[PDB]
Scaffold this active site. Structure first.
Site, PDB file in Angstrom:
ATOM      1  N   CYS A 146       0.800  -1.216   0.000  1.00  0.00           N
ATOM      2  CA  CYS A 146       0.000   0.000   0.000  1.00  0.00           C
ATOM      3  C   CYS A 146       0.845   1.284   0.000  1.00  0.00           C
ATOM      4  O   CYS A 146       0.347   2.354  -0.354  1.00  0.00           O
ATOM      5  CB  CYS A 146      -0.965  -0.005   1.187  1.00  0.00           C
ATOM      6  SG  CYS A 146      -2.141  -1.378   1.168  1.00  0.00           S
TER       7      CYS A 146
ATOM      8  N   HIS B 214      -2.743   7.845   6.002  1.00  0.00           N
ATOM      9  CA  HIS B 214      -3.081   6.748   5.116  1.00  0.00           C
ATOM     10  C   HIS B 214      -4.581   6.536   5.240  1.00  0.00           C
ATOM     11  O   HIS B 214      -5.277   6.390   4.237  1.00  0.00           O
ATOM     12  CB  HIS B 214      -2.324   5.481   5.509  1.00  0.00           C
ATOM     13  CG  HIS B 214      -2.233   4.469   4.411  1.00  0.00           C
ATOM     14  ND1 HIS B 214      -1.961   4.811   3.104  1.00  0.00           N
ATOM     15  CD2 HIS B 214      -2.373   3.122   4.426  1.00  0.00           C
ATOM     16  CE1 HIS B 214      -1.941   3.721   2.359  1.00  0.00           C
ATOM     17  NE2 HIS B 214      -2.188   2.681   3.137  1.00  0.00           N
TER      18      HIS B 214
ATOM     19  N   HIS C  42      -9.365   3.161  -1.477  1.00  0.00           N
ATOM     20  CA  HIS C  42      -7.965   2.784  -1.337  1.00  0.00           C
ATOM     21  C   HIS C  42      -7.441   2.020  -2.549  1.00  0.00           C
ATOM     22  O   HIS C  42      -7.803   0.865  -2.776  1.00  0.00           O
ATOM     23  CB  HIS C  42      -7.741   1.967  -0.063  1.00  0.00           C
ATOM     24  CG  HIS C  42      -6.313   1.605   0.183  1.00  0.00           C
ATOM     25  ND1 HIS C  42      -5.258   2.264  -0.428  1.00  0.00           N
ATOM     26  CD2 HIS C  42      -5.746   0.659   0.965  1.00  0.00           C
ATOM     27  CE1 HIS C  42      -4.120   1.738  -0.029  1.00  0.00           C
ATOM     28  NE2 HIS C  42      -4.387   0.756   0.821  1.00  0.00           N
TER      29      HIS C  42
END
Lengths: 289, 193, 48, 48, 434, 145
Positions: free
Chosen positions: E133, E285, E326
């Site tokens: 990620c 994040h 995401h």
């Protein structure tokens, strides 16, 4: 089923369908978070001078205070400089508000209010209850986010210290809802974390009860003319079961605390012929007493 | 992929699997509860799409392969790790251990001379996690039982991530170049950087 | 030569230094990452 | 008149004629009552 | 042995997807390219073009000021080439006709390799991080690294990933993705289900896309006379450590705040004459998972606490994952993009998906979660942002971003005035080209 | 009287033709005081962002930033999205303008919001998965035992 429908009509079975479920509930117990965002919005947008009564009103709304909210206010205030006139007024007022926050006290009231929706008497009562450091159960017929956003707006304004608000989907026309709702209102106040998330039903013994739920005449399904018959269940009979319901919880869980039910009586029956609804329906409240 | 020309003979299936059958075909497939056994019969009509097993012969019969009989277990890797991780992971994990063995052993000895955030990992891949990738795309389309950690284990960075979790425990940088055939030298470049 | 023969060189760590005392180390978790010079003593066999 | 309009829209002074406003002007040249005194575009019709 | 066709019903009915009707063809990509390359390639290819369009167009104009071997490409992926991968493993086992270039097109580096072949044509560095990620911020770190050592004077940093079938089933199996059947049961619409720091946060929404940024030497940017979007004051990736526990999140990103006045975070600021209080915004994040949000909050709370952040001068934090969802590989770049746009416009974007702040987060006093946009006008400036991203397997990262006007202060009044002249002329020519 | 007042309407003449469009993007500077030395900092050792772009669920960096900060698109916001979503096409055939790509109808810049944005919002951002792969994970995903 055809015979049953023939007697009762088309709208009655369709409107009596269940609504409430224990998993859709939403709890707002945070003042600490909403008070911080509320202050910085004032501080940045400050225009009107010290003569404003809004500053005194907002200071009473900012009266929610603890170690958390003080750490917010005492900071943005101490970070403020002598740069301008607004900065001179903000710094002084904030330091005074930071001092008044330290000694702030609270009250407690546990209330259940129905018919709390926007642009109504009860909505003005709700925000005022929240202004009085209470704990309020607020029911909404329409669960849509436009109704949900309103109570968030109403709470983040009028909430004091010790104040906790609860918003839920509710239908006063459903006996199932009434039974299921108070079964939720009266159980535990516990949250079990196992492999999964289970919230045990929050138990708060109601001080004040406000049956302001007010069905309005909208007849799209053709329901016209049968409504005054059905509302007699809602305005009285279902209230009776609502009063009986909270009476059971109080007796079973054994409290001597008296639930104060404010009965929304219609003004002065018999001397008005033009209302057509209020005047006649609420005269049996004398019989309910 | 072949289209069934005439209705196939009914086969017994569970209610959950048979309802699924209906979700693809539904004009072309037919499913019923069997009153006694509660299970469902699955009957494919004409026009259904069927995938029928076949074979192929290929050109490459030879490759350069790690000596037969190699085990990460012999090197001392626990069976739980061998299962949960891709084959490519066993390569980088043992190599890292033997790489340290050139100088020091205990990876935390680095934390004596250095603050842990100053330990970096730059590890390249052309693809990496290949097995774990081919394991999902077969397995899912085949509904075979396959591991839940698949997509985590197919990330070309997850292999040295596994090493940092299991061994070094550094608090510092992690980079994972893709250089196709050149990742190795490309990795050194960034390790230097 | 000790590693090659015994199968020793691969030991999967329990992470003793992380959790060593349940109560304080979880509290000390913040303090460790915050201050620069905090490190391992060798004498206790690598304690945090 | 020019000043009156472009005072209300001062941005007209700093920006490009919109790419969709170019065909419009060239289109207006073709429908104009008395033929245009200039050449708006160099293209296949330049002789015309 | 026979393999007989069946079906399955799955939990995830919703994802964050590029607007319906998108075509690389409309942008002007040739049909031959569209065929031969993976879908993920079309994302990084068009993004690179639009990334250049911010300043210059013709990629060879770089070769006027710079020797071609000084052009670098640092491009991250969590996986990348996903389609081309799933295309081989299906196709081969299925004997279906599939392309011969498959394994070349599944290399996560091949996508920007395609861009270098088609567009820039640089003779210089190519790096391709895997940060799970965190690749995006991890990519920036190495893009920064390539410049300072003189290996390359111009780099392209970024990350990209795709959303396919088996990408979904990997997350849903791993339990990390929010279960749609549960969201609808709670009365949650598709737009409202990604909520960062919320009490009810159920896990992340998976997305697709890609983004890139052009990082250059400060001296070159002035000399070429391009726009300066922001100064990267620092970039770092950080691991965590040895542990058994699966929910236990990596905290190692704290290593940047170590040392106080001697810390990398504060010294980066101090070199611009900027203090620790002068970081207004952190871009979290903010995965909306229950594991990441409070941990990243505790992390940002602590990095501020030890560096002497003035009490109650909280970092105002935006969650872009509540909007864009995401996307694994291109996560921190979308945040990187948003942060530049934050600095120049001054505006701090809201989290509009926040109904209620998690009561656990109260313990963090250096952190403020804003539900409504705070728009900073000309009289209300801002200074420096921070992009933080936590990848899988202890991949954590931090990128300190600082306002462009901090750099213009190092030119002296004569040259400072001379640069504004060039930058102004470029903006006008840039608006033209765009 | 009041129902009648509500029942008795009237039309006050309103003649309006509105359009939507804008100048190229500009930049609003911020007021910042800086006491600094010039020659001290090496420009060769600094990393600076020249430009950037993104492709995502909300479109490019321009449209995504508009949706994030504002929550609603501007004239250029809907114009760009309708172009990217492929709602509007450009023909050199006579009438020479912007045309709707689906129905083949000429469009101006104003009606872009009215004719499209309602459908744009639905089919952009986050929504139910549209199947471009002839497979639905949530509904039916092919299995072979």
């Amino acid at each position: 089923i055809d015979l049953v429908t023939a007697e009762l009509g088309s709208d009655w079975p369709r409107l009596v369908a269940p609504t409430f479920d224990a998993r859709k509930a939403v709890v707002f117990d945070d003042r600490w978070a909403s008070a911080r965002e509320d202050l910085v919005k004032l501080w940045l947008a400050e225009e009107g001078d010290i003569d404003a009564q809004w500053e005194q009103l907002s200071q009473r709304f900012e009266g929610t205070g603890h170690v958390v909210a003080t750490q917010a206010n005492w900071w943005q205030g101490k970070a403020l400089a002598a740069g301008r006139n607004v900065h001179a007024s903000l710094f002084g007022r904030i330091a005074a508000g930071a001092e008044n926050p330290g000694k702030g006290r609270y009250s407690d009231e546990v209330a259940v209010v129905t018919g709390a929706s926007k642009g109504s008497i009860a909505a003005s009562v709700v925000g005022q209850l929240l202004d009085g450091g209470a704990t309020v159960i607020a029911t909404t017929s329409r669960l849509d986010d436009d109704r949900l956003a309103f109570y968030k707006q109403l709470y983040r304004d009028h909430a004091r210290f010790d104040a906790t608000l609860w918003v839920v989907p509710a239908n006063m026309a459903s006996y199932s809802d009434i039974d299921k709702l108070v079964e939720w209102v009266g159980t535990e106040q516990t949250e079990s974390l196992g492999p999964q998330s289970i919230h045990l039903k929050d138990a708060q013994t109601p001080t004040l009860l406000f049956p302001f739920a007010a069905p309005r005449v909208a007849g799209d399904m053709s329901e016209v003319g049968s409504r005054a018959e059905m509302e007699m269940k809602v305005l009285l009979w279902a209230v009776q079961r609502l009063i009986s319901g909270l009476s059971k919880i109080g007796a079973e869980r054994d409290i001597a605390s008296r639930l104060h039910v404010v009965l929304p009586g219609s003004p002065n029956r018999g001397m008005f012929g033009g209302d057509g609804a209020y005047g006649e329906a609420k005269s049996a409240l004398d019989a309910l007493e | 992929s072949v289209f069934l020309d005439k209705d196939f003979t009914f086969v017994v299936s569970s209610e959950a699997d048979a309802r699924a059958f209906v979700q693809f075909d539904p004009e072309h497939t037919v499913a019923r509860p069997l009153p006694d056994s509660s299970d469902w019969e699955v009957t494919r009509k004409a026009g259904t799409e069927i995938r029928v097993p076949r074979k192929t012969k290929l050109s490459r019969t030879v490759g350069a392969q790690i000596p037969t009989g190699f085990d990460p277990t012999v090197w001392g890797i626990s069976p739980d790790m061998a299962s949960s991780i891709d084959r490519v992971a066993l390569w980088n994990i043992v190599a890292t251990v033997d790489a340290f063995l050139s100088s020091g052993f205990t990876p935390t000895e680095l934390m004596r001379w250095v603050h842990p955030s100053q330990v970096a990992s730059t590890q390249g891949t052309g693809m990496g996690g290949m097995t774990s990738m081919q394991t999902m795309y077969h397995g899912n389309l085949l509904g075979r039982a396959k591991p839940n950690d698949i997509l985590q284990e197919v990330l070309p960075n997850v292999v040295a991530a596994h090493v940092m979790q299991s061994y070094v425990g550094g608090y510092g940088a992690m980079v994972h170049p893709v250089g196709a055939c050149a990742t190795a030298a490309v990795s050194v470049e960034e390790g230097v950087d | 030569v000790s590693a090659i023969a015994g199968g020793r060189p691969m030991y999967e760590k329990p992470a003793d230094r992380r959790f060593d005392h349940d109560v304080p180390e979880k509290r000390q978790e913040a303090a460790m990452l915050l201050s620069t010079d905090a490190r391992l003593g060798e004498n206790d066999q690598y304690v945090l | 008149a020019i000043t009156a309009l472009l005072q209300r829209y001062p941005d007209a002074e700093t920006v490009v004629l919109h790419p969709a406003d170019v065909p419009f002007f060239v289109e207006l040249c073709k429908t104009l009552g008395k033929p245009v005194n200039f050449v708006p575009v160099i293209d296949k019709d330049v002789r015309r | 042995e026979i393999r007989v066709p069946r079906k399955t019903k799955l939990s995830r009915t919703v994802g964050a997807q590029i607007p319906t009707g998108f075509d690389p063809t409309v942008w002007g990509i040739s049909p031959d390219m569209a065929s031969s390359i993976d879908r993920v390639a079309l994302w990084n290819i068009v993004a690179t073009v639009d990334a250049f369009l911010s300043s210059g167009f013709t990629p060879t104009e770089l070769m006027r000021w710079v020797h071609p071997s000084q052009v670098a490409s640092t491009q991250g992926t969590g996986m990348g080439g996903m389609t081309s991968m799933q295309t081989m493993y299906h196709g081969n086992l299925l004997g279906r006709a599939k392309p011969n270039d498959i394994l070349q097109e599944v290399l996560p580096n091949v996508v920007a390799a395609h861009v270098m072949q088609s567009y820039v044509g640089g003779y210089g560095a190519m790096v391709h991080p895997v940060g799970a990620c965190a690749t995006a911020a991890v990519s920036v770190e190495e893009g920064v690294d390539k410049i300072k050592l003189g290996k390359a004077d111009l780099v392209i940093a970024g990350g990209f990933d795709d959303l396919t079938l088996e990408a979904i089933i990997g997350f849903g199996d791993m339990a990390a993705t929010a279960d749609t059947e549960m969201m609808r049961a709670k009365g949650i619409s598709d737009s409202k289900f990604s909520r960062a720091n919320d009490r009810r946060r159920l896990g992340f929404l998976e997305a697709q896309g890609g983004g890139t940024i052009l990082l250059a030497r400060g001296d070159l940017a002035l000399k070429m006379g391009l726009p300066v979007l922001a100064v990267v004051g620092y970039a770092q990736s950080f691991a965590d450590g040895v542990h058994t526990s699966i929910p236990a999140p990596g905290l190692g990103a704290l290593g940047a705040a170590r040392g106080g006045r001697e810390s990398t975070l504060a010294r980066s600021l101090a070199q611009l004459g900027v203090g620790a209080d002068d970081i207004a915004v952190i871009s979290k994040h903010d995965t909306s998972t229950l594991a990441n949000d409070p941990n990243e909050t505790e992390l940002h709370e602590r990095i501020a606490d030890s560096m002497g952040r003035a009490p109650g001068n909280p970092l105002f934090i935006v969650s872009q994952k509540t909007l864009t969802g995401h996307a694994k590989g291109g996560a921190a770049v979308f945040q990187m993009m948003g942060l530049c746009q934050i600095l120049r416009d001054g505006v701090i974007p809201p989290n509009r998906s926040l109904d209620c702040v998690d009561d656990e987060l109260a313990t963090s006093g250096h952190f403020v979660w804003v539900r409504e946009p705070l728009d900073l006008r000309g009289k209300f400036p801002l200074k420096a942002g921070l992009v933080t991203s936590l990848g899988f397997g202890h991949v954590s990262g931090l990128v300190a971003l600082v306002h462009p006007e901090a750099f213009i202060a190092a030119l002296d009044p004569s040259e400072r005035e001379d640069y504004r002249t060039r930058a102004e002329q470029r903006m006008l020519a840039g608006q033209r080209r765009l | 009287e009041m129902s009648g007042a509500a029942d008795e309407s009237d039309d006050e003449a309103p003649a309006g033709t509105i359009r939507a469009l804008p100048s190229p993007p500009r930049g609003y500077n911020p007021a910042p005081a800086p006491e600094w030395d010039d020659l001290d900092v090496d420009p060769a050792d600094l990393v600076v962002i020249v430009g950037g772009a993104e492709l995502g669920p909300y479109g490019s960096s321009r449209t995504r930033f508009e949706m994030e900060v504002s929550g609603e698109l501007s004239a250029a916001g809907v114009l760009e999205l309708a172009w990217t979503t492929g709602m509007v096409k450009w023909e050199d055939d006579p009438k020479a303008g912007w045309y709707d790509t689906e129905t083949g109808e000429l469009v101006p810049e104003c009606e872009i919001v009215e004719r499209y944005h309602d459908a744009v919002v639905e089919r952009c951002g986050i929504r139910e998965f549209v199947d471009d792969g002839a497979i639905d994970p949530d509904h039916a995903s092919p299995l072979l035992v």
